[PDB]
Design a protein around this ligand. Structure first.
Ligand SMILES: COc1ccc2nc(C)c3c(C)nc(-c4cnccc4C)n3c2n1
Ligand SMILES: [Cl-]
Ligand SMILES: [Mg+2]
Ligand SMILES: [Zn+2]
Length: 322
């Protein structure tokens, strides 16, 4: 594990958020893009507004965040920027649904989101499961996500980083398990079953938020919605982020090329022409149904669906020549 320097977390401690951003941060469509130096402070802020200023010990929180940053890799997409973007979308969903979730869940989900892709290498579970490589060995299924949670706990175990130590022993294991499950949920492999179960649960009426199994499934879809939130930003942002996503995909093709394997079109840089069609298929089968089910369960999340609906309309334009 890599540790933050003294000036990094103390600098974050002294950081105050600009007043104009406070109003904008509340919105679903908010793009963190133009404020890089303010990303850790944006997270501090969201935690304080959601959970409280004294919830976490500030010194520990600031040490936690800056260290979390240093354990995100310098990769095109699954990087520190992605983590904050996912975290912010969670804050937005929470704020519009505040009382549905306990303080422990809100604390848990925000930290989980920031951590959910820790030490990502830009490679998929498929790549690691086919090659091996001592990560598919350690984690047979779902896989990078188990690594991300493992990484999260490893950071919490660094000197003065454990933001959760002041919780009761019961709450401490509660929050860790909330986080474990939330991070595991970001394995898109598990998303498809989860959304179908929830679709069934909502449609029949059987869905009950007091039901802990149902509750875990709701949080799971929330993690998926947040992980996908770049499909819900303004088209120029959405479009540019896709470039970072495929840059990773194509590199996973390149390494498969370097070791005598022929990758899928999605990961073949010699197949860029297929990208807009793959994006349409991704929205139609993944993003659209995700935000549709989430709006049915958490109605205040509708803006996320509409921004996705507009971004689909943009991808159809690319396809048709416009
Ligand atoms: C797993 O193939 C794909 C294929 C197309 C994708 N298009 C988008 C926009 C996207 C966003 C935001 N996020 C992810 C994602 C989700 N789960 C794991 C990895 C990624 C990059 N995708 C995509 N993923
Ligand atoms: Cl690491
Ligand atoms: Mg991930
Ligand atoms: Zn992610």
């Amino acid at each position: 594990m890599s540790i933050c320097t003294s000036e990094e977390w103390q600098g974050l401690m002294q950081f105050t958020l600009p007043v104009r951003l406070c109003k904008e941060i509340e919105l679903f469509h908010f793009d963190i893009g133009p404020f890089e130096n303010m990303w850790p402070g944006i997270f501090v802020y969201m935690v304080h507004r959601s959970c409280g200023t004294s919830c976490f010990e500030l010194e520990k929180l600031c040490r936690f965040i800056m260290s979390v940053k240093k354990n995100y890799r310098r990769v095109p997409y699954h990087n520190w920027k992605h983590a904050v973007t996912v975290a912010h979308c969670m804050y937005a969903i929470l704020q519009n649904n505040h009382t549905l979730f306990t303080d422990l869940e809100r604390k848990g989900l925000l930290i989980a989101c920031l951590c959910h892709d820790l030490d990502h290498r830009g490679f998929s579970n498929s790549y690691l499961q086919k090659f091996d490589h001592p990560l598919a060995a350690l984690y047979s299924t779902s896989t990078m996500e188990q690594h991300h949670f493992s990484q999260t706990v490893s950071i919490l175990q660094l000197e003065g980083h454990n933001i959760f130590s002041t919780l009761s022993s019961s709450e401490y294991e509660q929050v860790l398990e909330i986080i474990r499950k939330a991070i595991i949920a970001t394995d898109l492999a598990l998303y498809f079953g989860n959304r179908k179960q929830l679709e069934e649960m909502y449609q029949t009426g059987s869905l009950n938020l007091n039901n802990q199994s149902h509750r875990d499934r709701v949080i799971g879809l929330m993690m998926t919605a947040c992980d996908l939130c770049s499909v819900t930003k303004l088209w120029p942002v959405t479009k540019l982020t896709a470039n970072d996503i495929y840059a990773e995909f194509w590199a996973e093709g390149d390494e498969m090329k370097k070791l005598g394997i022929q990758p899928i079109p999605m990961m073949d840089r010699d197949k860029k022409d297929e990208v807009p069609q793959g994006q349409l298929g991704f929205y139609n089968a993944v993003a659209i149904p995700c935000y549709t089910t989430l709006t049915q369960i958490l109605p205040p999340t509708e803006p996320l669906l509409k921004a996705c609906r507009d971004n689909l309309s943009q991808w159809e334009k690319v396809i048709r020549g416009e």
